């Protein structure tokens, strides 16, 4: 299974933690928090950092701590650190083009608008070839209101489909790791949250 590094996009701070944007992050925290890992604070890859190990395999895993059109900055400096590819990454983020309740894995694609993917593909090298946990989140009905949409808070009914996207997006990364990435795929992409 061909990933080392999992980070979860997202903006810095209390204020954004339940926006939308977000999304990634909730991913690595939960998978943290059921592995009892601390993430640690590393103002050298711009971000809260920490690594557990999942069937005799180390997954590091990074929340960067930059603005989220410079999280390429924290993903680089730490992958180029610790020789990881950008092959052997997968960046979880808020998904316009999927509804609330449904995640995917996908390598590769462009970035959507989402601000946080376009730097990560800049800041490793032109490179769109890291994977994807695509978080859906639904989008609005026009263009030009997107941004003011992923810094909104979802309503209740819309976070409890998020909430169980990400238990089982944490469930499926588990699986990738035990299983590999054709099951936890199979496994994700026929969910839809209840």
Same mark, same amino acid.
């Not at 939960?30 to 604070?41: G, P």
């Not at 069937?55 to 059109?69: C, K």
């Not at 730097?119 to 989140?137: A, M, P, Q, V, W």
């Not at 941004?147 to 997006?169: I, T, W």
């Given at each position: 299974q061909p990933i080392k590094l999992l980070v979860g996009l997202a903006n810095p701070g209390p204020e954004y933690a339940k926006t939308r944007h977000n999304a990634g992050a909730w991913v690595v925290e939960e998978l943290a928090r059921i592995h009892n890992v601390t993430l640690?604070?590393?103002?050298? %890859? %711009?971000?809260?950092?920490?690594?557990?190990?999942?069937?005799?395999?180390?997954?590091?895993?990074?929340?960067?701590?930059?603005?989220?059109?410079?999280?390429?900055?924290?993903?680089?400096?730490?992958?180029?650190?610790?020789?990881?590819?950008?092959?052997?990454?997968?960046?979880?983020?808020?998904?316009?083009?999927?509804?609330?309740?449904?995640?995917? %894995?996908?390598?590769?694609?462009?970035?959507?608008?989402?601000?946080?993917?376009?730097?990560?593909?800049?800041? !490793?090298?032109?490179?769109?070839?890291?994977?994807?946990?695509? !978080?859906?989140?639904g989008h609005p009905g026009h263009k030009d209101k997107v941004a003011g949409y992923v810094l909104g808070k979802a309503p209740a009914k819309e976070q409890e489909c998020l909430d169980a996207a990400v238990d089982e997006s944490v469930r499926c990364l588990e699986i990738l790791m035990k299983d590999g990435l054709t099951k936890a795929q199979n496994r994700l992409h026929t969910f839809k949250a209840e």
């Amino acid at each position: 299974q061909p990933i080392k590094l999992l980070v979860g996009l997202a903006n810095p701070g209390p204020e954004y933690a339940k926006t939308r944007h977000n999304a990634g992050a909730w991913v690595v925290e939960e998978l943290a928090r059921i592995h009892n890992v601390t993430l640690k604070n590393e103002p050298k %890859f %711009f971000g809260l950092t920490g690594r557990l190990l999942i069937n005799s395999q180390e997954l590091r895993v990074l929340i960067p701590t930059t603005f989220m059109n410079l999280s390429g900055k924290a993903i680089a400096a730490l992958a180029n650190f610790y020789q990881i590819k950008p092959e052997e990454i997968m960046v979880a983020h808020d998904e316009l083009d999927l509804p609330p309740g449904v995640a995917k %894995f996908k390598q590769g694609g462009g970035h959507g608008g989402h601000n946080g993917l376009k730097d990560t593909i800049s800041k !490793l090298g032109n490179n769109k070839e890291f994977y994807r946990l695509r !978080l859906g989140i639904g989008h609005p009905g026009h263009k030009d209101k997107v941004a003011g949409y992923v810094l909104g808070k979802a309503p209740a009914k819309e976070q409890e489909c998020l909430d169980a996207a990400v238990d089982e997006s944490v469930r499926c990364l588990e699986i990738l790791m035990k299983d590999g990435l054709t099951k936890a795929q199979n496994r994700l992409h026929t969910f839809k949250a209840e």
